[PDB]
Amino acid sequence: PLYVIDKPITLHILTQLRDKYTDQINFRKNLVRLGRILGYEISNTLDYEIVEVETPLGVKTKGVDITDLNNIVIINILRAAVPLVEGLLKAFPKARQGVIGASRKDMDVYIYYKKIPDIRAKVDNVIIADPMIATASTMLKVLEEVVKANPKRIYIVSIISSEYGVNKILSKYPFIYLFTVAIDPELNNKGYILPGLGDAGDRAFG
Amino acid sequence: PLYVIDKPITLHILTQLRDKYTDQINFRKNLVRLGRILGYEISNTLDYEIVEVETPLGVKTKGVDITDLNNIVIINILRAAVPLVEGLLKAFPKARQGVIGASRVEVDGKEVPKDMDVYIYYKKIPDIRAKVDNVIIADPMIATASTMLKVLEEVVKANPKRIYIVSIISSEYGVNKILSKYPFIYLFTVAIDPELNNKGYILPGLGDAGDRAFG
Amino acid sequence: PLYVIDKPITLHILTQLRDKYTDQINFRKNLVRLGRILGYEISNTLDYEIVEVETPLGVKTKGVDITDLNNIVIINILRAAVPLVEGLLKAFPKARQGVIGASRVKDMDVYIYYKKIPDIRAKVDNVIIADPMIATASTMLKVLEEVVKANPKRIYIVSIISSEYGVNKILSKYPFIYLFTVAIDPELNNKGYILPGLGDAGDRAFG
Amino acid sequence: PLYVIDKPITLHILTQLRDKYTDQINFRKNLVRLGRILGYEISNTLDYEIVEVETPLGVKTKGVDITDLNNIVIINILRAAVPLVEGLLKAFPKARQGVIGASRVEVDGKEVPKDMDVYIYYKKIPDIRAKVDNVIIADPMIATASTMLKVLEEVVKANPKRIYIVSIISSEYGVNKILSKYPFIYLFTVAIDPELNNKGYILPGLGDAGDRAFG
Ligand SMILES: Nc1nc2c(ncn2[C@@H]2O[C@H](COP(=O)(O)OP(=O)(O)OP(=O)(O)O)[C@@H](O)[C@H]2O)c(=O)[nH]1
Ligand SMILES: Nc1nc2c(ncn2[C@@H]2O[C@H](COP(=O)(O)OP(=O)(O)OP(=O)(O)O)[C@@H](O)[C@H]2O)c(=O)[nH]1
Ligand SMILES: Nc1nc2c(ncn2[C@@H]2O[C@H](COP(=O)(O)OP(=O)(O)OP(=O)(O)O)[C@@H](O)[C@H]2O)c(=O)[nH]1
Ligand SMILES: Nc1nc2c(ncn2[C@@H]2O[C@H](COP(=O)(O)OP(=O)(O)OP(=O)(O)O)[C@@H](O)[C@H]2O)c(=O)[nH]1
Ligand SMILES: O=P(O)(O)OC[C@H]1O[C@H](OP(=O)(O)OP(=O)(O)O)[C@H](O)[C@@H]1O
Ligand SMILES: O=P(O)(O)OC[C@H]1O[C@H](OP(=O)(O)OP(=O)(O)O)[C@H](O)[C@@H]1O
Ligand SMILES: O=P(O)(O)OC[C@H]1O[C@H](O)[C@H](O)[C@@H]1O
Ligand SMILES: O=P(O)(O)OC[C@H]1O[C@H](O)[C@H](O)[C@@H]1O
Ligand SMILES: O=P(O)(O)OC[C@H]1O[C@H](O)[C@H](O)[C@@H]1O
Ligand SMILES: [Mg+2]
Ligand SMILES: [Mg+2]
Ligand SMILES: [Mg+2]
Ligand SMILES: [Mg+2]
Numbered sequence A: 001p002l003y004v005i006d007k008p009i010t011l012h013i014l015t016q017l018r019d020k021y022t023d024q025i026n027f028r029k030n031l032v033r034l035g036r037i038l039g040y041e042i043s044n045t046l047d048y049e050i051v052e053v054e055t056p057l058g059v060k061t062k063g064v065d066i067t068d069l070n071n072i073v074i075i076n077i078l079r080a081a082v083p084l085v086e087g088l089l090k091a092f093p094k095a096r097q098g099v100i101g102a103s104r105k106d107m108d109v110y111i112y113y114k115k116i117p118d119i120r121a122k123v124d125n126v127i128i129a130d131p132m133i134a135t136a137s138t139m140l141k142v143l144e145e146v147v148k149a150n151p152k153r154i155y156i157v158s159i160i161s162s163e164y165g166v167n168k169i170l171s172k173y174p175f176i177y178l179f180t181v182a183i184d185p186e187l188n189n190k191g192y193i194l195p196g197l198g199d200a201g202d203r204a205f206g
Numbered sequence B, D: 001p002l003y004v005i006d007k008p009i010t011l012h013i014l015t016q017l018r019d020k021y022t023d024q025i026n027f028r029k030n031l032v033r034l035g036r037i038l039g040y041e042i043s044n045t046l047d048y049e050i051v052e053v054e055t056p057l058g059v060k061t062k063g064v065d066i067t068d069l070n071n072i073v074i075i076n077i078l079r080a081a082v083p084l085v086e087g088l089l090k091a092f093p094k095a096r097q098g099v100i101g102a103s104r105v106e107v108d109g110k111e112v113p114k115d116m117d118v119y120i121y122y123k124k125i126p127d128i129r130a131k132v133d134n135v136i137i138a139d140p141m142i143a144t145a146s147t148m149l150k151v152l153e154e155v156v157k158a159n160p161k162r163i164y165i166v167s168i169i170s171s172e173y174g175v176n177k178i179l180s181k182y183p184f185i186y187l188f189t190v191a192i193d194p195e196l197n198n199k200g201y202i203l204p205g206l207g208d209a210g211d212r213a214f215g
Numbered sequence C: 001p002l003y004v005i006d007k008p009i010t011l012h013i014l015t016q017l018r019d020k021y022t023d024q025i026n027f028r029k030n031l032v033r034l035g036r037i038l039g040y041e042i043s044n045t046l047d048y049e050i051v052e053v054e055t056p057l058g059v060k061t062k063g064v065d066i067t068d069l070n071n072i073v074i075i076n077i078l079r080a081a082v083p084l085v086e087g088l089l090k091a092f093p094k095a096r097q098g099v100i101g102a103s104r105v106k107d108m109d110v111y112i113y114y115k116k117i118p119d120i121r122a123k124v125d126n127v128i129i130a131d132p133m134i135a136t137a138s139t140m141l142k143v144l145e146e147v148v149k150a151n152p153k154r155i156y157i158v159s160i161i162s163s164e165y166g167v168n169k170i171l172s173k174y175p176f177i178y179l180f181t182v183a184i185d186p187e188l189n190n191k192g193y194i195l196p197g198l199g200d201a202g203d204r205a206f207g
Helices: A008-018 A024-045 A081-088 A137-148 A163-172 A200-205 B008-018 B024-045 B081-088 B146-157 B172-181 B209-214 C008-018 C024-043 C081-088 C138-150 C164-173 C201-206 D008-018 D024-043 D081-088 D146-157 D172-179 D209-214
Strands: A002-004 A049-054 A060-065 A072-077 A096-103 A110-115 A125-129 A153-157 A160-162 A177-180 A182-184 B002-004 B052-054 B060-062 B072-077 B095-103 B119-124 B134-138 B162-166 B169-171 B186-189 B191-193 C002-004 C049-055 C059-065 C072-077 C096-103 C111-116 C126-130 C154-158 C161-163 C178-181 C183-185 D002-004 D049-054 D060-065 D072-077 D096-104 D118-124 D134-138 D162-166 D169-171 D186-189 D191-193
Touching (some): A024 A081, A024 A153, A024 A177, A024 B008, A060 B008, A081 A125, A096 D209, A110 A137, A110 D118, A137 A163, A160 A177, A163 A177, B024 B081, B024 B162, B072 B146, B081 B209, B095 B146, B095 C201, B119 C111, B146 B162, B169 B172, B172 B186, B172 B191, C008 C024, C024 C154, C024 C201, C049 D008, C059 D008, C072 C138, C126 C138, C161 C164, C161 C178, D008 D024, D024 D162, D024 D186, D024 D209, D072 D081, D081 D209, D096 D146, D169 D186, D172 D186, D172 D191
Parallel strands (some): A072 A125, A125 A153, A153 A177, A160 A182, B072 B095, B072 B134, B169 B191, C161 C183, D072 D096, D072 D134, D162 D186, D169 D191
Antiparallel strands (some): A096 A110, B052 B060, B095 B119, C096 C111, D049 D060, D096 D118
16 A cells, blocks of 8 residues: 655655755754654554553543554664665664665666565564665565565655656565655656655755 | 544653553653643644745745734643643744643442532633733543533633634543633644543543653 | 862863853753763762673773762752753762752841752762852852751762852851852952853853 | 773663563664763764854854754665664764665684674765765674775775774774774774684674564
């Protein structure tokens, strides 16, 4: 399923990200802000069980507990992802982290580095983060690795994704929960997202 | 209008708050967490205009600018509200802050107090701009609304563009008691507990947020 | 004893606070920043016992545990103090907070408007009284007059700037107190403001 | 020069880090806490300039401005450092983040490792303005300093104004192996553990910071 989070709050931040006038401090900071907000969206979709707690005045009342918050494995795709993940962790403190290294349309992408914790089959909720999904190659390559682990669920957290990508990804993995703030219409020749926001990695790491 | 924010995330934190076993650190911390989350919600209700920015790649594109984020006066109802306001400020760093030291009078009686001797022992509110500012009144719990209504009497006078109320728990009695006397108010809350008890406390409730968070 | 924290880092932030060009966001934010920084300074002065812990290679070694971090009772001198206490809480999360509103009415003394201080454990709690500006030290002394009655294990005072008049009037009446501050300004006018200071902290912070 | 930051506050956090029973969250969180604390310590050694600002009181006063907070490049030695750098950034927001991915060529019981082979699987480092930038290399642990020296190998031909090393724990062997070759480096650390074992692990140490933090 596709989850486009276009509420005023996120669209407001996205705007500042897109604005070529926002410096690296504010750019990185907004990536963090969206990561936490984005993690709160993902939070509401997770499996939870009904519990009972007694209150100070000695009365019992039903409550909620998002159990799966203990079963999260965030996958950091090297670079631009670091800041976004820094937001996600605000919503998934108990999550373990994996990092991946890969690099280059349609051209195949190769994985050159990868240290991922052990994904508990049928239990874990893997969250693969990367601010931008253009052609969707990077993402799909990481996916191969992830599906092998047979996780309970797989989420993809991005800021902007091209239509080409969303469809590319959801067409081969309809069971994947793809979250994003905006879906931009095109990819020029260089494989860039338009309007997009330029190069996230560069705008944040500086 | 009434805004009950009962998404799994907030209901999850509320549970923690209600849990008598939840210690002081965690109690105070969840009040902050909800304040932040509630500010974000309140943020999506604010007036915004569409602007048009230019991306590094040279093109223009429509965006969003919540202009009213520059126009926010938060009212921190002294004590319990401090952790909650800390939360809100994460969503409204351009907000001015008024502090009101209200204090309720205890009354052990037969029924449930309708209104109580609520006198304000403190009140330093910054200048509110008529027909422009969005005043946000914060207080973790609204029981009989005594306190709340008492403050609204002060804020109203300054005719703000609109008034919000941010609470974690609110009794049915109160919600109605406020939306009746001030119908065009934006009341946000995570849960609406059925009834108030013999001593004006909310049931089930989460205990005395004031004591729980400051000790 | 007097603890003047004038390291480059704090003097750097103070400068921004003093600067008339620093807005409500940045002013309030630096009060928070200094609050946690001074909190760490107070931390280094607290009681702590030596403990033993086993490291991941099954090797036991000595370490440190500032348990007194469990016995903190911070007091808000209403308004300007809130942002300051916010940062201190970053260093004393387990602290119980106290709120207290006062006001004036040459060195005109004071009257207590509001006062809610949690129960202080005699010879156990480390009470920390927060208030960014200590001018004629009256507000401060009036609050002390109550805290001292509770015989806490210790008493700290956390401020950003304080006048020499104040530092001396406070440390002369209660010598055992730990007064922390970033700067000690020279004078104060006929009105009672600290010069050059930074203006009305409460107004610069709250707007 | 060597800067051992062993004040009660940092020794208190280190203890928690060493405590094998310190769960992942708390472990990661303390790495952040120390990163920020250690940064404020570094800020205190940076070149500063006296300035003059204006109080609203119309009056004027001399002040401090560590102008060098604009000339900082942090190199996040990959994995272990993420939490550590995450806090240094709390002290150096105007810093550019360089990122090197180092991986040690393990070895098993033999004798005690004197220097190990390092495999570079990633490198994105901004341009270091010669005679201008203060480069800060971060890595929780320094065992044989193999990794460290490997990185210094590049950060040095760039002649930065100054080079800092931020670590939580470093072995005697390492501190000496680094400062003997790069006498003028500013090496910051909370503790200097005595010996290393046959696998090159610090003792007593605190385990594998990367494994503890990334789980
Ligand atoms: N047990 C424990 N958990 C912690 C601690 N600090 C942070 N956490 C958890 O990590 C999450 C994110 O922590 P931070 O990076 O400090 O983020 P934050 O901006 O303070 O977010 P909030 O804590 O929600 O206000 C929190 O929501 C907590 O659930 C700590 O000292 N102990
Ligand atoms: N201009 C400016 N604004 C700041 C600064 N620090 C914080 N703010 C603003 O104040 C809000 C809340 O700041 P913090 O208390 O640091 O909150 P936070 O936990 O860091 O959360 P974030 O919103 O993710 O940064 C931010 O969303 C900013 O809009 C600062 O140094 N400069
Ligand atoms: N048990 C527990 N302790 C917490 C939690 N969040 C914060 N704390 C404690 O409170 C302190 C400060 O918390 P915050 O208000 O989030 O401050 P912060 O800006 O995140 O600062 P640091 O956590 O030190 O990085 C931490 O150092 C913790 O000791 C939490 O979720 N659980
Ligand atoms: N311009 C701008 N600067 C910011 C903002 N938020 C943070 N900063 C800067 O980034 C630094 C660290 O910010 P954060 O990562 O949020 O750190 P923090 O946990 O909030 O800690 P504090 O800065 O003490 O509040 C600060 O020293 C600020 O100079 C923001 O919204 N705008
Ligand atoms: O809707 P109402 O019936 O007026 O009650 C709500 C208020 O009462 C409690 O404060 P209290 O006066 O007990 O002060 P404290 O929280 O600072 O102890 C509570 O924290 C609210 O502030
Ligand atoms: O001082 P040295 O003897 O060179 O060894 C110490 C290094 O080992 C760890 O990284 P590691 O290569 O194990 O990678 P990881 O921490 O990312 O898992 C640590 O982060 C240091 O970089
Ligand atoms: O493979 P694509 O989806 O086309 O592009 C993905 C990468 O390109 C950008 O650097 C993103 O941040 C990812 O790292
Ligand atoms: O009593 P003084 O030390 O002269 O002045 C103290 C108060 O004046 C300022 O508002 C400070 O913030 C304190 O609240
Ligand atoms: O696998 P690595 O991270 O390279 O080495 C792991 C060990 O190194 C650390 O000192 C701890 O003792 C760990 O056991
Ligand atoms: Mg926190
Ligand atoms: Mg109250
Ligand atoms: Mg490592
Ligand atoms: Mg911040």
